[PDB]
């Protein structure tokens, strides 16, 4: 109530807006950790504490309605940043089944090579089946690579490089079990393990569609808060 | 009341760098964020300049030239962030290329051993070992891609620790099929390739994380001299 100390409020409105919309980006640097998340879940309760504040505050009909706009996108802002940290979690989740099924298709390859070399046959034959093996192995490697790739650079170019190999493996290893007709046991947990691996890379794929989604939808939100400010802001300054 | 009006661009244009400078990690140092984010800077410097031809008070003056010298420091901090993401970009064609080399070293390598008509026994013994050593660096491109997607010191350290056992291992398979010590040493000189580039993109990641730290320390400069002469203008 003393002259000059509404645009001040307003001042301070504005600050916590831009802490923000700076924790909000500094959370998406951290790859979207759980630090960065409780950061960036108290600057959004600091402006929103402040627009309540000044809810209460300020008498005019045209600024109450202008902090109930506010409200209203700040209660937008708290489901889109939801949005958000449930696609950080999705990606993680997706990741940890990655990298579990990924040691699942290593042992149950690696059993496959064993029981293989050990039944004894003709060294000609077993060198041949070792090729066979080696190939399959290091084809998988090469999608964990590509797949690694992808998760560090989130391009369609990387996912969709990464989902054909993934491809490629599969039918090359329904093509291996006719090959070696005696493991068609052991090559069908190889080929189960593969098929979880794809599951998780989709799903990965498709948190980071919703990462970005509530991204675009806050920083319209961002821009629209700005706006309402600004508005609240030249009413006082005038 | 204008002087106020101008100042209030200032600031806008602050918030607009900073946001700015963050969407530029977040792309990673893309060229066309980093595009971006000079332009921003440019236009709050800009502002910086066209008010100190205009604000005629030697307290708000001084504050302006202050205001312009923390600019400056912005400025090659923001240069110094830029060559570090060249830097990580240069390492990681390099690796990526050092990889090829090693591996394709080794594949033919292989072909060379199931050429041979030696006796199968020893022919596959050897295909093992030559195989074995192609998967250790598959695995480690995958570590050292882990550390590419998450920074930490945790995976850099795994990685590099990694990448110096397959080299130790590399070195003993030497001793073991002196047979080729040609075609291992180009494999070896590749992998030595390849971690001389892990640590040159490790060393970019360390300037990246300086500038950064600089830049928000300029930027909490720039908002006490920014907020000071907004707070002169109140009056």
């Known amino acids: 109530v003393p002259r000059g100390s509404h645009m001040g409020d307003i001042g301070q409105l504005n600050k916590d807006l831009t802490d923000l919309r700076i924790a909000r980006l500094q959370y998406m640097i951290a790859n979207g950790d759980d630090t960065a998340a409780a950061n960036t879940l108290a600057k959004l309760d600091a402006f929103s504490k402040q627009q309540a504040y000044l809810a209460t505050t300020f008498k005019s009909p045209e600024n109450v309605k202008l902090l109930g706009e506010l409200g209203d996108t700040i209660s937008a802002y708290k489901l889109s940043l939801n949005k958000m940290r449930q696609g950080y979690d999705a990606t993680r989740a997706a990741r940890?089944?990655?990298?579990?099924?990924?040691?699942?298709?290593?042992?149950?390859?690696?059993?496959?090579?064993?029981?293989?070399?050990?039944?004894?046959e003709a060294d000609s034959?077993?060198?041949?089946?070792?090729?066979?093996?080696?190939?399959?192995?290091?084809?998988?490697?090469?999608?964990?690579?590509?797949?690694?790739?992808?998760?560090?650079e989130?391009?369609?170019?990387?996912?969709?490089?990464?989902?054909?190999?993934?491809?490629?493996?599969l039918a090359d290893t329904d093509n291996l079990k006719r090959q070696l007709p005696s493991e068609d046991a052991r090559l069908q947990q190889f080929e189960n393990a593969v098929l979880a691996y794809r599951?998780?890379?989709?799903?990965?794929?498709?948190?980071?569609?919703?990462?970005?989604?509530?991204?675009?939808?806050?920083?319209?939100?961002?821009?629209?808060?700005?706006?309402?400010?600004?508005?609240?802001?030249?009413?006082?300054?005038?």
Do not use: C, H, W
Request: cysteine-free; charged content about 25%.
């Open 96 to 120: 940890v089944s990655m990298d579990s099924s990924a040691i699942r298709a290593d042992q149950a390859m690696d059993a496959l090579s064993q029981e293989v070399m050990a039944r004894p």
């Open 125 to 152: 034959v077993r060198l041949a089946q070792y090729q066979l093996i080696s190939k399959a192995r290091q084809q998988l490697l090469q999608v964990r690579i590509d797949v690694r790739g992808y998760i560090a």
């Open 154 to 169: 989130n391009s369609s170019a990387n996912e969709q490089a990464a989902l054909r190999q993934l491809d490629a493996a």
């Open 199 to 238: 599951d998780a890379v989709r799903q990965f794929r498709d948190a980071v569609a919703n990462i970005t989604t509530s991204r675009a939808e806050m920083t319209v939100q961002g821009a629209d808060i700005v706006k309402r400010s600004d508005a609240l802001y030249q009413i006082q300054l005038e």
